[PDB]
């Protein structure tokens, strides 16, 4: 206030702002590999789904969509990248 660093804002009070009102806008969503031990290989999923994503082979499930992030189904794991 009165004088402040607009070019180097603290990543704390930048983390709080709106995805469009940041210094250079970018997403707040992420991808993740998901597994269901019946299979040995993994599927790449977006955090906000819309489409209820099904695995490679087994007609299983993975996630049912919502107003935002997807809800991964029961017994599943996920590393993020």
């Amino acid at each position: 206030v009165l004088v402040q660093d607009l070019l180097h804002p603290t990543a704390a009070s930048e983390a709080r702002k709106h995805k469009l009102k940041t210094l250079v806008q970018g997403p707040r969503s992420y991808f993740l590999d998901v597994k269901c031990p019946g299979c040995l290989n993994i599927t790449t999923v977006f955090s906000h789904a819309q489409t209820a994503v099904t695995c490679e082979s087994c007609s299983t499930i993975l996630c049912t969509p919502t107003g935002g992030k997807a809800k991964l189904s029961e017994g599943t794991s996920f590393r993020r990248k």
């Binding site: 206030v1 009165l2 004088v3 402040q4 660093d5 180097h8 804002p9 603290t10 009070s13």
Partner: protein
Amino acid sequence: MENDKGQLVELYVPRKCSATNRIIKADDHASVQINVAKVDEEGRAIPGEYVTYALSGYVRSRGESDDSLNRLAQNDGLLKNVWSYSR
């Protein structure tokens, strides 16, 4: 505000806020001058020796006189930490 040949004409070069650099004019009986005493070895505040700061009425009314004092004095060596430039 000189004149034709040299000669500084026109009286009264007014003060100036150290926070905004807007003029401090006469009828502003709400601006302020803060004398900050230069100390020396082991306490001892040296009477008749100050680092001074002028603050305009606008800033004090706006509530920015504390925060702007911190910034002004700290980047003048009589404070460390306290103030952050980012936020």
